[PDB]
Design a protein around this ligand. Sequence first.
Ligand SMILES: CC(=O)SCCNC(=O)CCNC(=O)[C@H](O)C(C)(C)COP(=O)(O)OP(=O)(O)OC[C@H]1O[C@@H](n2cnc3c(N)ncnc32)[C@H](O)[C@@H]1OP(=O)(O)O
Ligand SMILES: CC(=O)SCCNC(=O)CCNC(=O)[C@H](O)C(C)(C)COP(=O)(O)OP(=O)(O)OC[C@H]1O[C@@H](n2cnc3c(N)ncnc32)[C@H](O)[C@@H]1OP(=O)(O)O
Ligand SMILES: [Cl-]
Ligand SMILES: [Cl-]
Lengths: 264, 266
Amino acid sequence: MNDIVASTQLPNTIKTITNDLRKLGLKKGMTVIVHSSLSSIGWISGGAVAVVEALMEVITEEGTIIMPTQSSDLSDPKHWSRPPVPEEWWQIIRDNVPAFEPHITPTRAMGKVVECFRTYPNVVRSNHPLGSFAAWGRHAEEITVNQSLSMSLGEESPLRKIYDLDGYILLIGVGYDSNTSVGLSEVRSGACELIKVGAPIIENGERVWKEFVDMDYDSDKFVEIGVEFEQKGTVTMGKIGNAKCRLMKQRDIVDFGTEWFRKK
Amino acid sequence: NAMNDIVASTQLPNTIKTITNDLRKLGLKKGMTVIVHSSLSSIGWISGGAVAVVEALMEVITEEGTIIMPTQSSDLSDPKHWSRPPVPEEWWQIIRDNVPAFEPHITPTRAMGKVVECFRTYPNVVRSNHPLGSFAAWGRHAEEITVNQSLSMSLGEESPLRKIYDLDGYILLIGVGYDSNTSVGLSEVRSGACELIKVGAPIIENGERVWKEFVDMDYDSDKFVEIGVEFEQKGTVTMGKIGNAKCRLMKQRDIVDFGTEWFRKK
Ligand SMILES: CC(=O)SCCNC(=O)CCNC(=O)[C@H](O)C(C)(C)COP(=O)(O)OP(=O)(O)OC[C@H]1O[C@@H](n2cnc3c(N)ncnc32)[C@H](O)[C@@H]1OP(=O)(O)O
Ligand SMILES: CC(=O)SCCNC(=O)CCNC(=O)[C@H](O)C(C)(C)COP(=O)(O)OP(=O)(O)OC[C@H]1O[C@@H](n2cnc3c(N)ncnc32)[C@H](O)[C@@H]1OP(=O)(O)O
Ligand SMILES: [Cl-]
Ligand SMILES: [Cl-]
């Protein structure tokens, strides 16, 4: 916090952030999926809330804002790597981990900006226990509704609805390893193996541990993809405060990513 | 490596069930009024994290009891007085003109913890109207406790601390000490322990952002830990473990009355 204060000349505000966003190319009526690091911007008067109102101010109710709202805490611990756990636990976890509930389940590894956004009124969340998304504005409903359990990031997912709407991805202080849209590139190219997975859901107002199948998604290659993608000079770059940001068409990068994965 | 440590220091995973046992053996029970302060990590590894702890509390207290937690948002306060991290005066007036108004369902808390962030978003959980020192509550007296908080004297005789007092309710500390024990700020108000300062914050007055100036105590938890140590000598605090976390259950009137008397004796 001390550092963030020191590295900032004047405070970022809803107004400054809003300028920065417009200079960069965000505009009224656009569809955008947003990924962010709050600290990278520098000190902000209002933190997470300011970044959310600024996005809202620029895009407006006639535009649409989406953000990933992933809750991997709820996943089968068999496959747990980041931190791992003893096999005696596994079956206890499956039998006791609380079911997914849109309004309730916290995100993990998404950031304060996402935590703040998902609790806003009129912001709606998709129905996936592990790979949900939240959306606001004009196509909120259409984007978040009827996500399939299997293939969370596939052709029945919000990623594809953003694709069909020819929308944009915005990266604030983060690189391609956070660019969830490229998962759809994975699916479309068959980049990863399938695995049997599970999660807890409310089936008939009744907790149930549901097994189903998904890709072993891997953002390991995303950064590489992004570097080679940017050689085409189709990404807009500029600062929000101190943060290096990026604005691109989602179709652009998803299509590049599909072709890239195949070329291997 | 923290998540790693927490896992390593845990024998079997904490769950809604285990946490609920521990609460009951400690003395939490149906129909009780309780203000809860916590460190999630202190418990050890929990299947479901914050959500587990929240459900466990509801499971024990039930809709016939009441749960309260502080939902403070000091981010929104006049930067003149900022100490923890400070900011150049050139900013100060900009901050007052631009920092977003408080909104109960919107404004994140600062320094309260994941358990509070999770709690305040639960349905049926209602939050008081203060832009800096709000509280959130659930169950039988949720409404009565959180309603009509005065601007000035946030933690005073028009605050939720007092409503908890009148109800003869409890304080629960999970993995945290008396420096987190917000109730004692009533003791401060009752005893006149701190100076009064002209403060401000941004509110929605008529669907309209307004910077409001008003007056409060310069509240100081610096002495709480000392107060707590001397308080516990009377042996009226119940102690026990939730997972790995050393916990404490006491009657709020007990500690607030001791605290009022303590502060005066000086
Ligand atoms: C394959 C896939 O799809 S990947 C999943 C998609 N992922 C995403 O979209 C998330 C992408 N973002 C990231 O990965 C980021 O690196 C993060 C969020 C993980 C980490 O970024 P951070 O800035 O460290 O975290 P975050 O954005 O939550 O903001 C919190 C930090 O901002 C800082 N902060 C607090 N208040 C303020 C303020 N007023 N002004 C500026 N900074 C502040 C604090 O440092 C805080 O950290 P703390 O929680 O340790 O106090
Ligand atoms: C006088 C007054 O009015 S002041 C007091 C008002 N405030 C309060 O009552 C707050 C009381 N609590 C405190 O003071 C504590 O020190 C805190 C909350 C500030 C810090 O406690 P922590 O345990 O570090 O954090 P918190 O309670 O948010 O728990 C989240 C942490 O638990 C850990 N965690 C995450 N998942 C799990 C899990 N399944 N199991 C266990 N731990 C987990 C993580 O470290 C997380 O922190 P990070 O993810 O940011 O690294
Ligand atoms: Cl668009
Ligand atoms: Cl008195």
